Each structure stands twice: as C-alpha cells, then as structure tokens.
Design an enzyme around this catalytic site. Structure first.
Site, short mmCIF file in Angstrom:
data_model
loop_
_atom_site.label_atom_id
_atom_site.label_comp_id
_atom_site.label_asym_id
_atom_site.label_seq_id
_atom_site.Cartn_x
_atom_site.Cartn_y
_atom_site.Cartn_z
N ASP A 115 61.68 60.60 23.90
CA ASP A 115 60.60 59.95 24.51
C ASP A 115 59.74 58.74 23.62
OD1 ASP A 115 59.74 59.25 27.04
OD2 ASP A 115 58.07 60.39 27.16
N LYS A 117 62.56 53.04 21.96
CA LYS A 117 63.72 53.04 22.62
C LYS A 117 65.06 52.92 21.64
CE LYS A 117 64.10 48.31 23.87
NZ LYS A 117 63.24 47.62 23.15
N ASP A 122 64.23 60.32 28.22
CA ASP A 122 63.41 59.85 29.12
C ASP A 122 63.65 58.22 29.04
OD1 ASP A 122 62.13 59.34 31.68
OD2 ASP A 122 60.03 59.50 30.56
N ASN A 123 63.57 57.43 30.17
CA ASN A 123 63.71 56.09 30.42
C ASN A 123 64.72 55.24 29.68
OD1 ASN A 123 60.30 56.46 28.88
ND2 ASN A 123 60.72 55.95 30.99
N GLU A 151 56.80 54.30 40.40
CA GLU A 151 56.15 53.67 41.41
C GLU A 151 55.38 52.39 41.08
OE1 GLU A 151 53.10 56.41 42.78
OE2 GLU A 151 54.52 58.08 43.45
N1 LIG Z 1 59.67 56.45 15.30
C1 LIG Z 1 58.80 57.39 15.98
N2 LIG Z 1 58.44 58.41 15.63
C2 LIG Z 1 57.54 59.25 15.99
N3 LIG Z 1 56.93 58.70 16.96
C3 LIG Z 1 57.17 57.50 17.71
C4 LIG Z 1 58.07 56.79 17.23
N4 LIG Z 1 58.28 55.47 17.76
C5 LIG Z 1 57.05 55.50 18.75
N5 LIG Z 1 56.56 56.80 18.73
C6 LIG Z 1 55.42 57.17 19.71
O1 LIG Z 1 56.29 57.80 20.86
C7 LIG Z 1 55.21 57.68 21.77
C8 LIG Z 1 56.11 57.18 23.15
S1 LIG Z 1 55.07 57.54 24.55
C9 LIG Z 1 55.50 59.04 24.55
C10 LIG Z 1 54.88 59.63 25.98
C11 LIG Z 1 54.95 61.07 26.08
N6 LIG Z 1 56.40 61.47 26.03
C12 LIG Z 1 54.63 61.73 27.49
O2 LIG Z 1 55.26 61.80 28.38
O3 LIG Z 1 53.39 61.63 27.48
C13 LIG Z 1 54.09 56.74 21.34
O4 LIG Z 1 52.98 57.41 21.39
C14 LIG Z 1 54.54 56.21 20.02
O5 LIG Z 1 53.34 56.19 19.14
#
Ligand SMILES: Nc1ncnc2c1ncn2[C@@H]1O[C@H](CSCC[C@H](N)C(=O)O)[C@@H](O)[C@H]1O
Ligand SMILES: [K+]
Length: 214
Positions: free
Chosen positions: A139, A142, A167-168, A197
């Site tokens: 998550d 991407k 996810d996503n 939503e």
């Molecule tokens: N290479 C990487 N390694 C670790 N964390 C990362 C990353 N790239 C992005 N992130 C972190 O991943 C998060 C994506 S948002 C994740 C939302 C969480 N899964 C939920 O459901 O509440 C962000 O906080 C971002 O800082």
C-alpha cells in the site's frame, strides 16, 4: 498542525482507549467530515478483514503505514502470537502510527520499521530474523509494487501460500504489477472491486498467492 496530527488528536479525544474498532471508527468519521479523498470506502475494509480471517497469517508485512489505519485494522484480527511488521519511509508518519497503536493497545503485536521498503526488505532475514512471510500488504508508492514483489521473491521471503494483497491497483493504478502477477505461474490472483466515494470510482485490490518458484 498537519493532517496526520489532527487525525491523531481526534482519535485520542473521541475513540475509546484500548478498543481498535473505536479507533478505526474515529478515523472513518474524521475523514468523512473533514477531508477529501484519503481513499474513503467500506469495501476495502471488508476485503482486508476477510483476507486476514481466511488465511490467519502468523507474520504479516505491511508496506506503507501512513497514520496506522490499515495496521490497526489488520493487527486487531491477528491471533495471539502473530505479528505485523510495517515499513514507513516517513518518520513523522511512523511517529503518528506508533501513537495510534499505543492508543489501540496493539503496540505489542506490531513493529514499525523506519525506512524505505527497498532498503529494509533485504535486511529482514539477517537483521530481523525473518524466515518467510505469511502475508504482504502492498500500500505504498505505486511504482514500487512490482519491484518490491520481485525483491521479496529474490530475498527468499515468500513461500507457497504466502498471500500478497495489493491496494489501489486500479486508481491511480499499478498495471505493470498486475500484468506480472497475473501472467506468472508463481502467483494465483483474485481481483476485488473497491469503490471509492469521493472520486466515485471503482478501484480494486488484487490478491496474489505465491505458488513457489517457477
Ligand atoms: N518505498 C517506500 N517505503 C516505505 N514506505 C513508503 C515508500 N513509499 C511510500 N511510502 C509510504 O507509504 C504510505 C502510503 S499511504 C498508506 C496508507 C495506509 N496503508 C493506510 O491504509 O492507512 C505513505 O505514508 C508513504 O510515506
Ligand atoms: K498468475
């Protein structure tokens, strides 16, 4: 001051201490009334809850913690003795997540790993004494879904039956990842529709079960 700090403060004042469900609901309520699309949708929670209950994983790896929503959600369904590791590249978000876990009373079940997934995954075996993962929840960024899947295989962290839940995968979308796990005899995939939503769009989650090296 920041979004993440307000969400935390909201939980601490409104949610019931010790009860993860109340924590999850304090957050759902907050994003409802205060925020635009932080990925608002109940299908996702439903799917995550069912995957955890269906496979009862002993050790879960979560990539990307943010404020600890998905961590609280998953960890509350873990059996006694089971564990969640969550990687978070951002120290401020990692700090919020820890707080969110202490309030939920889940801190003994979860361990936050501070750093980038691409740096931490190769250290899981030798530094964090991990043999294999039972479940991985992707998550984070991407463009790292596919690379980090490949890296997980390469470091020998997957075993026959390891569940990957991503996810996503539609919005904004990880189509390279999907083409890979669907095309590989090493994964058996299922797709789950996930309506969001505020963007009124059908996103999705992909469940990919590792079949062993091929
Ligand atoms: N290479 C990487 N390694 C670790 N964390 C990362 C990353 N790239 C992005 N992130 C972190 O991943 C998060 C994506 S948002 C994740 C939302 C969480 N899964 C939920 O459901 O509440 C962000 O906080 C971002 O800082
Ligand atoms: K496949």
């Amino acid at each position: 001051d920041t979004k993440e700090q307000r969400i935390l403060r909201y939980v601490q004042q409104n949610a019931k201490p010790g009860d993860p469900q109340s924590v999850l609901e304090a957050i759902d309520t907050y994003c409802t009334q205060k925020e635009w699309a932080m990925n608002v949708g109940d299908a996702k929670g439903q799917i995550m809850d069912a995957v955890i209950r269906e496979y009862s994983p002993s050790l879960v790896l979560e990539l990307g913690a943010y404020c600890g929503y998905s961590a609280v959600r998953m960890a509350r369904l873990l059996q006694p003795g089971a564990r969640l590791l969550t990687m978070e590249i951002n120290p401020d978000c990692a700090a919020i997540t820890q707080q969110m876990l202490n309030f939920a009373g889940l801190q003994d079940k979860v361990t936050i790993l501070n750093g980038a997934s691409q740096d931490l995954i190769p250290q899981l075996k030798k530094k964090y004494d991990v043999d294999t993962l039972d479940m991985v929840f992707l998550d984070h960024w991407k463009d790292r879904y596919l690379p980090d899947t490949l890296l997980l295989e390469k470091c020998g962290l997957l075993r026959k039956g390891t569940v990957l839940l991503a996810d996503n995968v539609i919005v904004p979308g990880t189509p390279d990842f999907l083409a890979y796990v669907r095309g590989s005899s090493s994964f058996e995939c299922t797709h789950y529709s996930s309506y969001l939503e505020y963007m009124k769009v059908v996103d999705g989650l992909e469940k990919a079960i590792y079949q062993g090296p091929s």
